[PDB]
Amino acid sequence: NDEREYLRHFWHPVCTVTELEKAHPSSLGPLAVKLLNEQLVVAKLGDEYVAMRDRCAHRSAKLSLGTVSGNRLQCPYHGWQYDTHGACQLVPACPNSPIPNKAKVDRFDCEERYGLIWIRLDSSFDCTEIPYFSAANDPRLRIVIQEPYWWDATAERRWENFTDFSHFAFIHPGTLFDPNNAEPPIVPMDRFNGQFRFVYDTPEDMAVPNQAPIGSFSYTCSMPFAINLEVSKYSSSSLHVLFNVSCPVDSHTTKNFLIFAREQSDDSDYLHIAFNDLVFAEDKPVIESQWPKDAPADEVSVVADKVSIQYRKWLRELKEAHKEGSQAFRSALLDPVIESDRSY
Amino acid sequence: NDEREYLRHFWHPVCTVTELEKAHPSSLGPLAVKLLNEQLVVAKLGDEYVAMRDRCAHRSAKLSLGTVSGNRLQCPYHGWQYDTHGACQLVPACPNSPIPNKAKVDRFDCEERYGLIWIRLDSSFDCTEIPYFSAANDPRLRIVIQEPYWWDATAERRWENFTDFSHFAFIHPGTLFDPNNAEPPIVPMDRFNGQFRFVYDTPEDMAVPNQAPIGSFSYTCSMPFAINLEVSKYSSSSLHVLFNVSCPVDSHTTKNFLIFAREQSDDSDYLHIAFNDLVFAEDKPVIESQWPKDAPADEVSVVADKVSIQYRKWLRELKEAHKEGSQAFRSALLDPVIESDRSY
Amino acid sequence: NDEREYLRHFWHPVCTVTELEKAHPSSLGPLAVKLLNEQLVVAKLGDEYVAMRDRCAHRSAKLSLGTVSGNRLQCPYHGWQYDTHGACQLVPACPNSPIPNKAKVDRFDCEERYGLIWIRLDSSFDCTEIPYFSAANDPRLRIVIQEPYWWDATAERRWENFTDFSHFAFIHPGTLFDPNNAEPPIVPMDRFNGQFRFVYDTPEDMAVPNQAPIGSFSYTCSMPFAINLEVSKYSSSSLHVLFNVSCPVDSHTTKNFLIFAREQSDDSDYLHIAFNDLVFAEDKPVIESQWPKDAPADEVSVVADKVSIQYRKWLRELKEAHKEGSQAFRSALLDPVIESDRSY
Amino acid sequence: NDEREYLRHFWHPVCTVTELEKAHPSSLGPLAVKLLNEQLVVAKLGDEYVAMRDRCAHRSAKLSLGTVSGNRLQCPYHGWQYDTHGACQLVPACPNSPIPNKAKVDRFDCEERYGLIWIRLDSSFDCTEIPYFSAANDPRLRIVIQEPYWWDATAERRWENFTDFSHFAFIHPGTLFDPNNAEPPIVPMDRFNGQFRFVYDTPEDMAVPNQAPIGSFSYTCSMPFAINLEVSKYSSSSLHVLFNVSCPVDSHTTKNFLIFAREQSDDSDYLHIAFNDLVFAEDKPVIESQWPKDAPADEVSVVADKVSIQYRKWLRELKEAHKEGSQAFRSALLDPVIESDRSY
Amino acid sequence: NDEREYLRHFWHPVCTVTELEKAHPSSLGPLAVKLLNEQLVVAKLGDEYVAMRDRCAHRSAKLSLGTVSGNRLQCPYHGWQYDTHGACQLVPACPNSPIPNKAKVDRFDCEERYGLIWIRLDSSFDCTEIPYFSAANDPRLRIVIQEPYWWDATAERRWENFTDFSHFAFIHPGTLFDPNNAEPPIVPMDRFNGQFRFVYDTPEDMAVPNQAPIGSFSYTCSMPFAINLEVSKYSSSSLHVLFNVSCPVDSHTTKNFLIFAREQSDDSDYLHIAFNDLVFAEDKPVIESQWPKDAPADEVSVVADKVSIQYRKWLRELKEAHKEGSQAFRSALLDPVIESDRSY
Numbered sequence A, B, C, D, E: 001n002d003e004r005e006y007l008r009h010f011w012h013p014v015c016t017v018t019e020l021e022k023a024h025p026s027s028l029g030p031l032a033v034k035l036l037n038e039q040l041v042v043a044k045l046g047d048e049y050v051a052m053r054d055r056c057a058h059r060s061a062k063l064s065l066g067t068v069s070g071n072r073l074q075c076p077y078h079g080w081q082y083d084t085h086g087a088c089q090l091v092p093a094c095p096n097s098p099i100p101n102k103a104k105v106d107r108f109d110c111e112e113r114y115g116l117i118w119i120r121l122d123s124s125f126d127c128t129e130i131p132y133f134s135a136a137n138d139p140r141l142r143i144v145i146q147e148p149y150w151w152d153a154t155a156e157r158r159w160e161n162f163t164d165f166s167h168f169a170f171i172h173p174g175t176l177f178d179p180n181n182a183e184p185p186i187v188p189m190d191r192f193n194g195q196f197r198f199v200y201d202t203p204e205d206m207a208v209p210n211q212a213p214i215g216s217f218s219y220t221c222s223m224p225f226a227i228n229l230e231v232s233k234y235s236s237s238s239l240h241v242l243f244n245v246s247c248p249v250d251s252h253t254t255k256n257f258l259i260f261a262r263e264q265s266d267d268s269d270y271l272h273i274a275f276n277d278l279v280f281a282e283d284k285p286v287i288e289s290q291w292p293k294d295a296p297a298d299e300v301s302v303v304a305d306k307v308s309i310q311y312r313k314w315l316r317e318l319k320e321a322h323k324e325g326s327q328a329f330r331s332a333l334l335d336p337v338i339e340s341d342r343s344y
């Protein structure tokens, strides 16, 4: 509904590069993806990742059932070929005739970063960037891109689940927190460069596995849905970074991505993947049970919900500012609001 | 919604006690149930059966995914603990802060009777009672509670199917009626104490199994959806009672309950259970086929439809009286209307 | 619904005679079918195929769960018996009482032809006929009725797929066309007696199987959805006829019928059936991908789309004429419009 | 085991012609079949149906995964081509070299008759013929070949089930016999030309469907597993022929064939197919329950079992005679033994 | 069993390191594997990969259902702890008593190499080594370990399929060879250091995909089941290495491993993985059809089968030498037999 239009102005991940390469035996795509209820197709056309509407201009077949040919995407039905700008450049049935002026499909800003493919549906405000991942190009850290995981929950509810200090004791007792560490601190939160920044020192000496990323937590949250969590672990005295971002596929579904990086990397990737998967399996049934899918005004917050409250407040401001136009939105997103004592 | 609001004032069964005990290994619940399209949770807190909306006040997680701890139902997400009145009495994240006054969920009338759990969503008219089961506390009779059975049919259509004299010869020829006995009598019907009361002396000497409850039929039907049928059986000269009641789960679904009692009880419970299941299997495809799900005004009645006609008329009066308020509803439900020669 | 009302005036196939005879052990039906989102029942009563709304006038049970009893269709619930005109002639519960005037269900035109059962929902314009199959009662030809095939695509899109000259090279390269023969001719198209008639000499010497019906193509397309394609095959110098017609089951679905006839018939029926199934398997994914299901005004045509363009034009004229009434519709359907040199 | 060797000398059906044509899109086969635990392949090579062992001489691949090429069967692995005599005639890898003398596979006598494909594994005694079907080439009769049906029972037990007069009342009460007609007559049985011949006049006026083939029964049973039953029906005064034969696939499995012919043929084939399928569904669970699969010496016969007793006696004689050689076997099979008063 | 005993003297791969790390959340195992019908367990104890019989000495529980605890493998039933030598070092029920001398399980050679785990069941001849992979520690090459693929075919038949020059034209026509290139050369074969070495210049200019490893083929085949194929590709003038090895799981099954390395590595791993999977899908049905599973003496060879013929000859020599003992086996395996012009 109208509520969601403002989200079209952000970059969202739609697939891993691995998913694109696996989709078709050519390794070039095409791959069908869905973002904010739009049916799109991604393909590697020459040196560029390209996103188009997954709908041929001729007779509305899905281009995602087609083939990459040179630097073009060829429709399966009558072979029309589309260039990187979504323009048809070949109509095989009519090689001599002029190509109709309207023989084109919409294309969208599309970039690879961190091993994911990102799409921005509306670029007209031109003030948003791909989220920040702190571990990129840090040679001290081994990076693992997990396979995406799908939840029957919204990106807003997923974000709040990831940053929620209060649930660890109840949803993750064997795994992330002691069940008796249920009272979290109230942390200062800064807005800077379109990111929420805040720091949380979790309890020490908790009976949790050594591969649990538990320690001093530094969050950099690129609004609206990306979370970069840098952990200085207590047990190993080493850096562990979690980068989690949700693709808002439609009104009730998320395709979620986790990339994690670690300084101590002589151990098995699957030690960590299995642990992450366990954490997600603990969250999933409870988060999918939340109803209605979008948080209504009747939910009852407590002081420990500060992160959730401030998140909802900023999202509300972004939605209102989007209605006022590009300049208002840019200010709402990028104006600093500092409440900690840190330098910037 | 509007057409069904009056049904919120009655007691409806939502599960058997056995279902509640089996739902969770604690034997205390919780169990998710649905009544009139409302999502509810049932649990046993101490000596009390409780029913609440299945939605935590904090972040809307389902309490039915939580845990009973003595006299509390604990939400699975952040561990809020609700007492028997639906009030949160512990917020683990803020154990010293005052609990918000809004931290409460709607609590509904919930009572065990006859081995079923009954819920009344609205008690404001204070004039409805749990349906009458004649065999309760008759020490002459052995009582068996069947597992519930789900039909893709409404409670009104199920009620009419149960009391329909004309269909026996076509739906139950091997089983309840001779295929020749298609013409039923037109019987007097009395309203008394919120019940329809009527008697039907079925045909004798029909080629049906001895466990068929066929004989003199005395109906006591607690409006809107319960039927107590006392059979003085021809074949065994002994009493057999069928108590059938439909939970209106939503606009197209019923969860149905059968409790039956018998005076001759030296035989197997499963002789009777299998017979009841055969009868229901004969009804099910035809009743599920009726469309639209609610009887529309264009259905064509004949004189043999008296029970159906009178039932529809009383339901319409109750709907209309509910709009006029508590006193009008009490009169529509509880005023006597006597057609027969009996006194009550 | 509103856009589709004009389609109710045509004869559409709903099942094969084989399907009707297999539906029930009596071989007389009843069989439930769906046409233009209407739920219907088909049965053979005496010598007549009948079609009625699949909904008893009494309590709305499905007559398709009932039984043919001589010259009657009997409802399963209370045994009301309907004659070939849809009128109830027996109410078993009240066999002496007058039958209500309202005890009737809607009866529709229903006729067997070519081994299919055809239904016309609206006969008020009295100007449509069952489509033309040229091989009927041609003793030189062996006729095979294939089993129906269901597609998640509309009847309009299926028709255009069948008559589309341009896609053969991309969808059927191994099978019907050389992949290099992508440029089709622009052929004259005649409207005559409610049929599109046109001829297409396909390319010779293509590397296609001997059982591929490739040759001189003569189309007689009974509007709106039936195609009679007479092929004078290059490879065998013999006649092969394809008759394809789509049942518009609802807004997203077709039940499609293929009947084929051949002059050289000493070979296996299954050589041809397997080839037809291969062609259909090649088309199915691409046609089911077209979205939205109904072609929007934004589709971009090229000159090679003449058949599709002219088809859409005639359908629009018929939809417009239907709003103006019976004589306007008759004119739009049956007036001749001749482009070619041929004489009719 | 050794018990079964004698069965290799008879013709057995292995598939319908329809199954062969459907197996491969060429309609020529190949089709894998199994007979007396031998893995065979059938193909149409030119004008001939050919059966070979399903095992290439080169590297033991299954020829049934190959292709018919001209009048040869081509192995899928390295393309060796086998002629109608099982001889390899092309080794693609070594076109100039002589083909090895041992490059051949066993072939077996293979013929089409009545729309089935028949194989005789051992032709060395040269005294057996394909079973007799009385309706072949009788233009008064419409013939229907049913799809094969598979049972977990032996061909001997299937034969005895088909000719058993005593079970109709218990396995087929609604369907073939009145439940009170349980006492059958003791009929004379003749051996003539390798066939058991006997006649049985079933009870009249039984409450069975009109499509039930009930009447005067004349059996011609080509030993060991084929039954030709000619029924002069009581209800319709018309001829109905049932031809049933079992393929002994292995020690515990049969692939069974039914062909039926009828003089009154204006009705639906599927009336009869559905009835036959119902009969088979009534027999199947009981016959599959018989254990051990081969009848042991401890079974207890009664006088009503005459047909079964005489069948087992003749099979025993054939098994013993096979051990004594070709002349003894020919006499055991073809010597007449007459006990009725009929002409031959 | 008897025929296969000699295979116990070689190193066979049983799982990838990835499979071991994924088996249990600890990433240390245990993992159940099967080799030559032996049930084994693999675990990482400290720095060592260990393999034991998967059967506790106490009450025969599977150790693969247990847990790694530091330098011990702990049985799930009564917690006996086994050291890297298969000796029990803790009996929790009797922690003071002497541990029985019989409280030990069989321990087998187990080593990681190339990302696979290798087991040698019998080390008594002390003359076999883990197979040679030429790309190991070649920094010019990117290495990809595929997931294992399981075939219902033996290791011998899989080896012959991989090195078979003749089948490419029939099994892989679109994919590896022109269908016309059916005649292979007869190449010299050298035995050196327990390897078969031979070179094959495949045909140039074939219509095969660019990612097809087609070019100059140099085989180094570590007996009995590992093949190292170095391809100097015609199409890219670059090195591509295929390392394929079969685990003989039991008498009918192989778990197969492919590792591939490539010099031009800027392209997608999944271009190559998809192509390898296509090749394997083309081979699988034909190789699984070969019967009996072990090649019998009756198979008929042609001159083009030189590689297969020489392979079977060497395997027979090794089986014969094994019966004569350690020094005979060492000689048969490691003595050089040079046919070519090359120098080693």
Ligand SMILES: Cn1c(=O)c2c(ncn2C)n(C)c1=O
Binding pocket: A161, A162, A163, A176, A212, A213, A214, A242, A275, A276, A277, A279, A280
């Ligand atoms: C929210 N969240 C996670 O989701 C998570 C985690 N470690 C692993 N995961 C997967 N930590 C520490 C965490 O806070």
Ligand SMILES: Cn1c(=O)c2c(ncn2C)n(C)c1=O
Binding pocket: B161, B162, B163, B176, B212, B213, B214, B242, B275, B276, B277, B279, B280
């Ligand atoms: C409606 N109804 C039943 O549903 C029924 C029954 N006996 C068993 N059942 C289950 N009888 C007598 C009956 O009238």
Ligand SMILES: Cn1c(=O)c2c(ncn2C)n(C)c1=O
Binding pocket: C161, C162, C163, C176, C212, C213, C214, C242, C275, C276, C277, C279, C280
């Ligand atoms: C559209 N179409 C078909 O669908 C078809 C065909 N031959 C078989 N089929 C099934 N031909 C020639 C054809 O043009």
Ligand SMILES: Cn1c(=O)c2c(ncn2C)n(C)c1=O
Binding pocket: D161, D162, D163, D176, D212, D213, D214, D242, D275, D276, D277, D279, D280
């Ligand atoms: C054994 N048998 C049948 O199996 C059968 C049948 N009619 C149909 N079937 C199928 N009859 C009359 C019969 O005797």
Ligand SMILES: Cn1c(=O)c2c(ncn2C)n(C)c1=O
Binding pocket: E161, E162, E163, E176, E212, E213, E214, E242, E275, E276, E277, E279, E280
């Ligand atoms: C046997 N074989 C293969 O199995 C193969 C291959 N390339 C990929 N695969 C998988 N080549 C060239 C090959 O000869």
Ligand code: FES
Binding pocket: A056, A057, A058, A059, A060, A061, A075, A076, A077, A078, A079, A080
């Ligand atoms: S629908 Fe894409 S080319 Fe025609």
Ligand code: FES
Binding pocket: B056, B057, B058, B059, B060, B061, B075, B076, B077, B078, B079, B080
């Ligand atoms: S949602 Fe229930 S405690 Fe938070």
Ligand code: FES
Binding pocket: C056, C057, C058, C059, C060, C061, C075, C076, C077, C078, C079, C080
């Ligand atoms: S619903 Fe059809 S007879 Fe009653």
Ligand code: FES
Binding pocket: D056, D057, D058, D059, D060, D061, D075, D076, D077, D078, D079, D080
């Ligand atoms: S296995 Fe048949 S040709 Fe080689």
Ligand code: FES
Binding pocket: E056, E057, E058, E059, E060, E061, E075, E076, E077, E078, E079, E080
């Ligand atoms: S069976 Fe292993 S410790 Fe007992």
Ligand SMILES: [Co+2]
Binding pocket: A161, A162, A167, A171, A172, A279, A283
């Ligand atoms: Co969580």
Ligand SMILES: [Co+2]
Binding pocket: B161, B162, B167, B171, B172, B279, B283
């Ligand atoms: Co009923």
Ligand SMILES: [Co+2]
Binding pocket: C161, C162, C167, C168, C171, C172, C279, C283
């Ligand atoms: Co097509």
Ligand SMILES: [Co+2]
Binding pocket: D161, D162, D167, D171, D172, D279, D283
């Ligand atoms: Co039988």
Ligand SMILES: [Co+2]
Binding pocket: E161, E162, E167, E168, E171, E172, E279, E283
């Ligand atoms: Co191969």
